[PDB]
Amino acid sequence: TITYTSQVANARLGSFSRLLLCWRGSIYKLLYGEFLIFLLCYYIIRFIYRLALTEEQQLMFEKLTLYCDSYIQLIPISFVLGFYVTLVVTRWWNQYENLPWPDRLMSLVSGFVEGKDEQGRLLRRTLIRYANLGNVLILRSVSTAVYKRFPSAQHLVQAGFMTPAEHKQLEKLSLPHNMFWVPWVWFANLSMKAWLGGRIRDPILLQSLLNEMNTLRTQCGHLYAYDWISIPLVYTQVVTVAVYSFFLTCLVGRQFLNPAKAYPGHELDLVVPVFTFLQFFFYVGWLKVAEQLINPFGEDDDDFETNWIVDRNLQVSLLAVDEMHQDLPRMEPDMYWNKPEPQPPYTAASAQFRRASFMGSTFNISLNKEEMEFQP
Amino acid sequence: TITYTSQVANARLGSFSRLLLCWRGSIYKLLYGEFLIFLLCYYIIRFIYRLALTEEQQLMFEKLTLYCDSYIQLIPISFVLGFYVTLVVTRWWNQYENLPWPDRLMSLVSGFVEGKDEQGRLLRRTLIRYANLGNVLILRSVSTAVYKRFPSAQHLVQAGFMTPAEHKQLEKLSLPHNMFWVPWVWFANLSMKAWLGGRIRDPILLQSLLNEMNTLRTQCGHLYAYDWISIPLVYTQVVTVAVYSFFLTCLVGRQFLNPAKAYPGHELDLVVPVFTFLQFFFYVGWLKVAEQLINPFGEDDDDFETNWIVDRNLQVSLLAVDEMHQDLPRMEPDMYWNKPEPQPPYTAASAQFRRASFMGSTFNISLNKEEMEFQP
Amino acid sequence: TITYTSQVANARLGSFSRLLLCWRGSIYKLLYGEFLIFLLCYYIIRFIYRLALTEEQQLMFEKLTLYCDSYIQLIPISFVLGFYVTLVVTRWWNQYENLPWPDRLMSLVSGFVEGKDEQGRLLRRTLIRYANLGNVLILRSVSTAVYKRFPSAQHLVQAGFMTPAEHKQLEKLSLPHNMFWVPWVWFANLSMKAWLGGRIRDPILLQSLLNEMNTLRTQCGHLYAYDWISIPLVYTQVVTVAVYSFFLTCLVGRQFLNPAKAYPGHELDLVVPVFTFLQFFFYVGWLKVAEQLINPFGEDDDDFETNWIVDRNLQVSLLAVDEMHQDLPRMEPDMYWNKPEPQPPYTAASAQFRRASFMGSTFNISLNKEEMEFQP
Amino acid sequence: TITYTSQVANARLGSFSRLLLCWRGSIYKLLYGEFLIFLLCYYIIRFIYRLALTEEQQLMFEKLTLYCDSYIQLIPISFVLGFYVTLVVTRWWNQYENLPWPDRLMSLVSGFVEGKDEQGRLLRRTLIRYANLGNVLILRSVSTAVYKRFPSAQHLVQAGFMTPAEHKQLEKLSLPHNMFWVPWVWFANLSMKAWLGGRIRDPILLQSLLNEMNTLRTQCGHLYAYDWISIPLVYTQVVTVAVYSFFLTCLVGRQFLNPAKAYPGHELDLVVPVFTFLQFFFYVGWLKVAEQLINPFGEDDDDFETNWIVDRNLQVSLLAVDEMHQDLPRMEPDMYWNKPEPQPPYTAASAQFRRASFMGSTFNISLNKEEMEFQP
Amino acid sequence: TITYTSQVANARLGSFSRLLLCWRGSIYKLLYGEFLIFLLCYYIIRFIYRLALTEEQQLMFEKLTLYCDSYIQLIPISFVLGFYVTLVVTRWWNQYENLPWPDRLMSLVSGFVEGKDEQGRLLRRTLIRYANLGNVLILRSVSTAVYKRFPSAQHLVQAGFMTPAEHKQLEKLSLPHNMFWVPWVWFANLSMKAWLGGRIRDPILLQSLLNEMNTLRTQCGHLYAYDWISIPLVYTQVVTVAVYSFFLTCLVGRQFLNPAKAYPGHELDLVVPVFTFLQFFFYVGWLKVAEQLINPFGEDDDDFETNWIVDRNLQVSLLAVDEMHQDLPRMEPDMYWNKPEPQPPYTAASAQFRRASFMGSTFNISLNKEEMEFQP
Ligand SMILES: [Ca+2]
Ligand SMILES: [Ca+2]
Ligand SMILES: [Ca+2]
Ligand SMILES: [Ca+2]
Ligand SMILES: [Ca+2]
């Protein structure tokens, strides 16, 4: 994930222009190899045409170049790319939206599961750990970075996500399917046990806990679904062939023909087909954005930081349920205890952001005395 | 369903190019027969024109070819295809999103329905079985693969989804409508009986169970609706006629006329209309993706694995409610029992994915001492 | 509603081509009259030009035909049609999604409202009948087919949706607004009475009932809103004028001029403007799909089966709450009572749909012994 | 709001054509003044060119007309308009979806708040009145029609939406912000008081009431947000300049040059630029639809009927909570008391809408005896 | 945020035209510097060509200008810009939708947390303050204006959002991540303490409070996600390069060549390339709208008023929970106490907005006596 929010906070002079000097997660990184292959092929073709063809063979090559340049427009590259890239971007944001965060559940566990003794500590930690374990099992199923971190359940045990007892229980339950669902059943059973044992004081609080845990389970299921049900291979193949065929046709249709022949479009003979290179940049860059976002859980620069999310979730959820349980700042009267209209100060750098309240669009409408009179 | 998530995890050199060597669920599989028919017709027309026409008749054919090539652009093939394919893809992902998974309900049943004795086992298994039976009844209504597996309710009884008593009850209730709704009414009644009999300890837990079951019912209803309310036949017919008319016009408009006549666009006479073939590939491939996804519950390669989903759901839900009921791993203090900042290790293959926390876009903003001062 | 899901289950050879032999709810049915009017006008114009004009008058007509053919492209027919048709299709699927189904509510009523005696029967039937009556009142407000079935509240009483007492109560409550909301207030009051009378054992179950009933009320409100707030007349008028002006210009711009004049585009003189006819087919077909779906509750072939939905809802809801109340199949141990990995059989027609479980995209990643080692 | 649902119920011959004879909320009403200004300017320019220019000055004007006609295509009017109009239409339907209806809340208040005595009447009326007052305060903030009806809180008191005591309380609470939120805090406090006083029998019912009231509050907040956060002025200015520049260029580029000069596109000299007028109609009509829907709470013909909604909501909510409280039709056995398959009759006008139930797409699949056999 | 809702309430003559005289948050403000740079470069190039080139060098420049003008169309500027701007606008409205408003929570806290004594005051104020503190911590993480107001937690303490005890607790809990989540855990714990201490009378009300607080937490998480996961840099770079390359090509391709050469498109030699300037206006204006909305929490004119929202939320939430707690207007019978059909008056300015109720589209359908008869 490359963040440039801070850079683009204000619309300034060449705001996006200053982003063209970025290498990490950039268009240049995505397509320099493809571009180099295309450039090598283009110049090989030019040198063959200019130094390994007789007059009649050069006339044949020129006729073919005119034909290819004329019929390039048949390829619906823009239409295919637009459809495909919109679909990939929509899926990409959905996939992020379905990353499970234990924050709601961890506040509920911290609050509802009672006891500052060792049994309460153990119970709260085990519940939040079941949520983290379920998340990590799905994430190592669908993310190459998480898989390379935890290539086995023994790795998960060594990293502290699973205890040896949990690992043995998983092995005993083993079915011929992904077992990422097991920690949710464990969570439900342990929450029921906590309520029956008096650690959860009310079935309403038990219901709240299970609702949060089930939300996380649905998010994990969506992640599994996106990893399983790929964008149809036929769509991917259509877009790939469109782009490749366009820029293979360009290799012959965008050559600089002999200016002596004074062809209708070939009066000026540059050496660098700058507009062909820009077209390659735009269209192959569109395809490269699709390629990078099609699996947002790979190891691209703009792919999600799944490992960071796993680490942060573990740290925050454990802190919240264990150390922050019934551990509050002293409740004292605040700065505005008897001020009916609190007005927090502004700094010299923010004084210009003090605004009068917007009171609705109708506020400034003006009416006469007779206009405002009620009729019988 | 063809999955290539693993292949497209990272944007590499010709990432999508390597997907053109896939046969299963590919564009070649979808349109080789149509393409062969088109090629045969194109070459029959070429041979007729070149070997069964006098000079004047060949001049007439050339005038018709120029006319057809000129007026091909009248067909709004791209506009029609774009609309239609976006609609089909949206429906396709909705249809997947409405496949019922018993995971939420099965965690709730495992937890809330009490008793390790035979009556508790029977009750939990029967509730989860009612959820599975409702799902399978809708799936065999809307999916050809599931129907071919279970072509009758007697097949459902032989496969263990329904008991003979349930089959008799369904026959007694028979109305002139799809009866996929019956297991939900059975579930509600059996849950009420379980709560009245003390197996469910609280009406709040009963409410949670019924909410999960009703979510599944709404998903099943959406599946029924998508199977019933097809995309309007008029839209389908418009797109079909557009594509067919375009590539029937091409058969005469894309012939290679006599290069002797030196026509404005006909200077070079290839034998293979490569750009016409690429256009056929793109446009008929778009139509073929729509054709494959229009009913995602058929037996295409990229259609959903409904039979696998049925099997997995049955296995997982039965395991969760029966064997995993009040059967938890031993609760022991975890690896980070007294570590306030747990730091799971990285492997040598993942050490590069260790990232500093993103602390917000404003973190690196720099201000002066006077800028940061509060004003009165 | 025309269903062809079964026909389009698999992408086969000319899958959509076989749908062009459908008459009911077809493009031919939608625009044969318009097409015949257009054809008659086109040929009247051709005959006038060819048999009722002098040489100079024919030259004037030819200049006008060239001018019209040149300036046809000014009309943004495709852009206007695309916007309009996307809007109509989105509204159409929303309108279907807001058709109220009593299934969730009827399972809750069957379960929660207790008593196998006459008072319990009466109470459950009356609650589900209030839900059906609310649905039917909105449906006869917004659907021409339902209105023609029930052109008065006396018709509703004769059909059994309303009792004479309910009809008198509605007449007493009469306000100068659509009264489709009344049965929801009746439902809330009768549910409160049932809970106070002991027929509903818990306020949590009462809350569940009222939540389901209120969901139905919100769906009915959405139906009312779509019937009231039409797509803006200005959008409709813009699209209509675009299509009509395009095909009125075509009547003069697409005539076959005298081939003697050998005009740049008029070398070949057919009698049938086939490409103009195809353009009419596509564009007027797009407009006709919009026309048919703009009110999906009319009496078109592809309009919703509101009458069938009303009948089915009444039958199913009454059966569910009355006959199926506390009437369950015998609970006996299932086929897989002691089989930890149930494997339902496959038929010979479905054996090919047996699939290995997808275990996640990272499953086949290969790593070295040193790659998988944790670092300190 | 102009409704034509009834007119467009069925796709008939010239279904949309018959809508071109509508004046109220029509394209002609929206752009006749702009069109008249454009026509006057066009003909002033034509008369200047034809009667106030020498030969050389007319040649200069003709060169400028050819130049302008050639370079008209540079303006991306269609692209800008498409984006803008889609955005405005999406916002418009959201704005309607966020109009608060008290129906759910009023059924809950009617049911849950107990007592047929004066205190119960007063309590129920006051709660529903707080919901109506909150709605009206936001609506008079964001709607010009509602503001012109209630230009002051004293107007609200005179119209009966607020009591003098409520007005005094609002004045006492006055902050420098829109106070539309106050009635929600009043509602929460009065509901708490009703539950503590025994008028609400259970905290679950209190929770239901507060959930409905909070849904209304979120809708009101969305209305406030749409009124405050306008579509960006930069988008609006871009679209306006595109359309204006296009039709100012047209004034000189679409003149009929001297047919004597026999220019490539100027052979025929009409007096009325019919295609320019149609382009103005389409493009300015698109802009006018955007202009009308950008604030759907103004006083356009197609703007929302906020005043009617306010009146209806007040009447219906008061009736529901006061007169309809515990006031039900007599519960008697219905028409189908002992009919397991109720079949409501059809009229002669609806007999054709009787349909057989759709039983799923797989119903008609045919299989052999060996195909349907289970394999071991 | 620039609001012009009031200006665009009604579609009037040149409704959007009157918005072109706006400077704040306008297209002119966004791109005057870029436009001036472009104009300076264009005229430098013109003067170089006309005053620093020999005849042959001018012929070379003219050939290059024709070549560039011909090949400008290769850049898919419109397609790239459309995709990008739609994505930015969608994200922008989502970002606004995820701004947390404490209104729902504050009504629930005002109602449910009991006690008019100092402990009740303190408890209610502390809960609402935890909600405000969580909101402000996320807002200063993601908003430059809020950060410049509160560049440190010590600033938050001085402004009254945090007490010194809360600041010390945050420092003690410090992890290497954004700590905006901490106040939600504090809220959950303090709500649990309030319920155990009798200040919250029921666990159902506790559940309601925690649901509202968790909704706010999810909104804050969405804000964090949008600030972290930027639109992919590759998309941004593609759009930037497209626009820049288009208007750098224009600098040479849109020069006025020597009219003496009488080139096909260069007959008339203006000095100002008006259509090039309009294209710059449109396309760079599209890019500038994207640039301004890409981070809606910067300090642009059309950026959100985060500081105003923070101030208003603090003031309103404190007033609601403290002064408005169990402080209601006197409950007296309303204006329509015994009026079954209340009819609030209209003013002379609003009498035209009195409308008859819309009773559904089927209301005016006419049927015969035989049509309306039920058949047996
Ligand atoms: Ca990737
Ligand atoms: Ca299929
Ligand atoms: Ca219709
Ligand atoms: Ca308006
Ligand atoms: Ca900004």
Curated annotation (Swiss-Prot), chains A, B, C, D, E:
Effect of S208N: In VMD2; uncertain significance
Membrane topology: Multi-pass membrane protein
Tissue: Predominantly expressed in the basolateral membrane of the retinal pigment epithelium.
Transmembrane segments: 31-50, 60-81, 237-254, 274-287
Gene Ontology cellular component annotations, sorted alphabetically: basal plasma membrane; basolateral plasma membrane; chloride channel complex; cytosol; membrane; membrane microdomain; plasma membrane; presynapse
This protein's record includes keyword Transmembrane helix: yes
Effect seen on changing M324T: In ARB; possible decrease in protein stability; loss of cell membrane localization in transfected MDCK.2 cells; reduced chloride conductance
Effect of T215I: In a sporadic case of age-related macular degeneration
Reaction catalysis annotation: chloride(in) = chloride(out); hydrogencarbonate(in) = hydrogencarbonate(out); 4-aminobutanoate(in) = 4-aminobutanoate(out); L-glutamate(out) = L-glutamate(in)
Subcellular location, record wording: Cell membrane; Basolateral cell membrane
Annotated control of activity: Inactivated by sulfhydryl-reactive agents.
Keywords: Calcium, Cell membrane, Chloride, Chloride channel, Disease variant, Ion channel, Ion transport, Membrane, Phosphoprotein, Retinitis pigmentosa, Sensory transduction, Transmembrane, Transmembrane helix, Transport, Vision
UniProt topological domain (Cytoplasmic) ranges: 1-30, 82-236
Ranges of the Extracellular topological domain: 51-59, 255-273
UniProt effect for mutating V241M: In VMD2; late-onset of visual disturbance
Region (Auto-inhibitory segment): 345-376
GO terms of biological process kind: chloride transport; detection of light stimulus involved in visual perception; gamma-aminobutyric acid secretion, neurotransmission; glutamate secretion; monoatomic ion transmembrane transport; protein complex oligomerization; regulation of calcium ion transport; regulation of synaptic plasticity
Effect of C41A: Impairs inactivation of ligand-gated anion channel activity by sulfhydryl-reactive agents
GO molecular function: bicarbonate channel activity; bicarbonate transmembrane transporter activity; chloride channel activity; identical protein binding; intracellularly calcium-gated chloride channel activity; ligand-gated channel activity
Quaternary state and interactors: Interacts with YWHAG; this interaction promotes the ligand-gated L-glutamate channel activity leading to the positive regulation of NMDA glutamate receptor activity through the L-glutamate secretion.
Disease with which this protein is associated in UniProt: Macular dystrophy, vitelliform, 2: An autosomal dominant form of macular degeneration that usually begins in childhood or adolescence. VMD2 is characterized by typical 'egg-yolk' macular lesions due to abnormal accumulation of lipofuscin within and beneath the retinal pigment epithelium cells. Progression of the disease leads to destruction of the retinal pigment epithelium and vision loss. Retinitis pigmentosa 50: A retinal dystrophy belonging to the group of pigmentary retinopathies. Retinitis pigmentosa is characterized by retinal pigment deposits visible on fundus examination and primary loss of rod photoreceptor cells followed by secondary loss of cone photoreceptors. Patients typically have night vision blindness and loss of midperipheral visual field. As their condition progresses, they lose their far peripheral visual field and eventually central vision as well.
Annotated family: Belongs to the anion channel-forming bestrophin (TC 1.A.46) family. Calcium-sensitive chloride channel subfamily.
Record's function text: Ligand-gated anion channel that allows the movement of anions across cell membranes when activated by calcium (Ca2+). Allows the movement of chloride and hydrogencarbonate. Found in a partially open conformation leading to significantly smaller chloride movement. Upon F2R/PAR-1 activation, the sequestered calcium is released into the cytosol of astrocytes, leading to the (Ca2+)-dependent release of L-glutamate into the synaptic cleft that targets the neuronal postsynaptic GRIN2A/NMDAR receptor resulting in the synaptic plasticity regulation.
Domain notes: The C-terminal auto-inhibitory segment (AS) modulates the open/closed conformation of the channel. In a closed conformation, the C-terminal auto-inhibitory segment constricts the channel concentrically by wrapping around the channel periphery in an inter-protomer manner. To allow chloride movement, the C-terminal auto-inhibitory segment opens partially, leading to significantly smaller chloride movement.
Protein name: Bestrophin-1
Organism, scientific name: Homo sapiens (Human)
